[PDB]
Amino acid sequence: SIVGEALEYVNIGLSHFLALPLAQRISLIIIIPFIYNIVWQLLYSLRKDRPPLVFYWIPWVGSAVVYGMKPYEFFEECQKKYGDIFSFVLLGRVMTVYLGPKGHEFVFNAKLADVSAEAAYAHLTTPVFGKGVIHDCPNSRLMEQKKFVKGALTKEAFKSYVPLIAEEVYKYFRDSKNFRLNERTTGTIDVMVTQPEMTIFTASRSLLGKEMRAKLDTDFAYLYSDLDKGFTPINFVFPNLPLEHYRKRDHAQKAISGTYMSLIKERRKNNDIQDRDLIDSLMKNSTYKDGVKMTDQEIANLLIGVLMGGQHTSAATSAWILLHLAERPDVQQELYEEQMRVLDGGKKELTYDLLQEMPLLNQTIKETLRMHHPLHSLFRKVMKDMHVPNTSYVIPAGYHVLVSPGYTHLRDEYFPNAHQFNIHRWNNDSASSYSVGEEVDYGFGAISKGVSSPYLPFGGGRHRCIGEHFAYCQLGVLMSIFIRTLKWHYPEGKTVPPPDFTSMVTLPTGPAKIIWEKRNPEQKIGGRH
Ligand SMILES: CC[C@@H](C)n1ncn(-c2ccc(N3CCN(c4ccc(OC[C@H]5CO[C@](Cn6cncn6)(c6ccc(Cl)cc6Cl)O5)cc4)CC3)cc2)c1=O
Numbered sequence: 055s056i057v058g059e060a061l062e063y064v065n066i067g068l069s070h071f072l073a074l075p076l077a078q079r080i081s082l083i084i085i086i087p088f089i090y091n092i093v094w095q096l097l098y099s100l101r102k103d104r105p106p107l108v109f110y111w112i113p114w115v116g117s118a119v120v121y122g123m124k125p126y127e128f129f130e131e132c133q134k135k136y137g138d139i140f141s142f143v144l145l146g147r148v149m150t151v152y153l154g155p156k157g158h159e160f161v162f163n164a165k166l167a168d169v170s171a172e173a174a175y176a177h178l179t180t181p182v183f184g185k186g187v188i189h190d191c192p193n194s195r196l197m198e199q200k201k202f203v204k205g206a207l208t209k210e211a212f213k214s215y216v217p218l219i220a221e222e223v224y225k226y227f228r229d230s231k232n233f234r235l236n237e238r239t240t241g242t243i244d245v246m247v248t249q250p251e252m253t254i255f256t257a258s259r260s261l262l263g264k265e266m267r268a269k270l271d272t273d274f275a276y277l278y279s280d281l282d283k284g285f286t287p288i289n290f291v292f293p294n295l296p297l298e299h300y301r302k303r304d305h306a307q308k309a310i311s312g313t314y315m316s317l318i319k320e321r322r323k324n325n326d327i328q329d330r331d332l333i334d335s336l337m338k339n340s341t342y343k344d345g346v347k348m349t350d351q352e353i354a355n356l357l358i359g360v361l362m363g364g365q366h367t368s369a370a371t372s373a374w375i376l377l378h379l380a381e382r383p384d385v386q387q388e389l390y391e392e393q394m395r396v397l398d399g400g401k402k403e404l405t406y407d408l409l410q411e412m413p414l415l416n417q418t419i420k421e422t423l424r425m426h427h428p429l430h431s432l433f434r435k436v437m438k439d440m441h442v443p444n445t446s447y448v449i450p451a452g453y454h455v456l457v458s459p460g461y462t463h464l465r466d467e468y469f470p471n472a473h474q475f476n477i478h479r480w481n482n483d484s485a486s487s488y489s490v491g492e493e494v495d496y497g498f499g500a501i502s503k504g505v506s507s508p509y510l511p512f513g514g515g516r517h518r519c520i521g522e523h524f525a526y527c528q529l530g531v532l533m534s535i536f537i538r539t540l541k542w543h544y545p546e547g548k549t550v551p552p553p554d555f556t557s558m559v560t561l562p563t564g565p566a567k568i569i570w571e572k573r574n575p576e577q578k579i580g581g582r583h
Pocket residue numbers: 118119120121122123175179188287359360361362363364367429430431432433519555556557558559
């Protein structure tokens with residue numbers, strides 16, 4: 055009646071194991087985690103208190119490759135097999151996806167104690183922006199930082215930004231190799247080259263001021279390029295690794311934040327603090343509610359973050375607008391007529407107020423943001439176990455929740471013929487967004503309380519975007535001028551490119567070229583160059 059001899063043969067087996075040929079021991083260190091992985095998923099599939107988990111062959115990697123290459127195609131397959139809630143493994147992490155408007159509610163209105171955005175995002179952005187701001191600080195600091203920035207983003211600021219943004223667009227048509235409208239009447243451009251330059255020029259001039267704008271004409275512009283490089287999904291797994299890419303980024307962040315602090319300390323020294331730009335504004339208005347002031351280093355890091363966020367979402371969006379309009383001369387024609395009616399055939403300077411009298415222009419932005427949400431996946435790390443309403447599912451702490459309003463933007467159920475670009479689906483509804491009812495303030499102004507809208511380009515809840523009006527202002531001036539100045543179309547046989555879902559924003563797969571030509575070949579842009 056001896057089990058003792060079994061326990062001996064366990065120990066013997068462990069010892070015979072350790073003495074295997076190194077060819078078999080490498081094999082086992084591969085085959086036994088592979089076998090265990092399959093065994094674990096099958097067992098996992100039994101738990102009725104967990105959403106279904108998408109099956110995967112490679113441990114740790116998970117569904118990373120198919121999710122990254124074509125996330126909306128991934129989501130649609132999963133939705134057919136499992137419905138709206140399902141999980142998948144992604145480079146070590148378990149992501150729980152909740153598709154559709156209830157998904158929006160579940161994640162964007164999640165209680166602050168249940169989930170954390172900074173725990174999800176901190177590695178992605180802190181290396182790039184610097185310490186102390188955005189996701190490298192507690193939520194209540196973030197709430198107030200959004201309040202400070204929003205304070206420079208008022209109707210009266212937009213009124214003064216508009217002629218500044220217009221000036222930069224015109225100087226870019228005049229001076230850029232891509233255009234030179236005083237010398238050339240037609241030409242070819244890559245919109246992934248032109249739009250990121252146009253966006254940084256206009257955002258700099260209006261948010262940072264003319265000094266910082268002036269510096270973009272120098273070799274300082276190269277540091278922006280270097281810091282721009284460090285803004286990549288790979289920071290999610292490799293935020294820091296001793297290589298040259300990471301070294302230029304860190305240098306750039308120091309060099310750029312140094313330049314902003316130089317200006318800040320310069321302005322405080324001369325008492326030269328007005329209401330020109332966002333720098334003036336944060337100098338006057340960056341004291342937290344427990345009395346602590348933001349440092350000059352933190353103020354500068356915040357400027358980098360604001361500028362970098364606006365840079366990528368807006369540049370991609372104007373690239374998409376150009377690309378969709380290039381095959382739709384009917385829409386270009388209709389926008390041109392609205393410009394002629396609102397601006398008296400051009401005998402009226404563009405103002406922020408007149409921009410609000412251009413519904414078709416704003417509907418074009420709205421519709422581009424529907425087809426091309428710059429951020430396909432928004433994340434939160436789960437901090438406490440969460441019950442999913444009307445289900446038996448519990449999402450345990452340590453999981454991530456993923457919400458994807460850009461996926462819902464492309465469903466026929468909520469947008470008839472969702473794959474078709476149509477600015478007229480927004481007729482009599484051209485506002486960037488609006489709360490369908492009740493509102494709430496998390497620290498940075500009253501916003502919509504419900505987040506169930508199928509259309510959520512700026513998200514919702516406490517992490518809701520605050521740059522929506524600035525983006526529309528910027529994109530509006532830009533497109534108003536393109537339309538009044540140029541017609542454009544595709545090279546023969548070219549059409550809208552598919553999105554690049556592996557970058558930070560869903561920008562077009564390039565080279566994405568359009569051919570432009572002047573509406574008025576003899577028109578000249580004045581000023582010195
Ligand atoms: C390894 C194999 C390969 C095939 N693969 N396998 C998987 N993937 C992959 C997966 C996921 C993703 N991403 C794309 C980027 N994405 C993402 C990027 C930025 C982001 O930002 C959310 C927060 C933080 O940044 C901002 C962005 N922003 C918002 N408005 C303007 N910018 C932000 C907020 C505030 C401020 Cl001040 C700045 C910034 Cl940047 O909001 C959220 C998600 C996550 C998924 C990419 C590739 C791959 O490429």
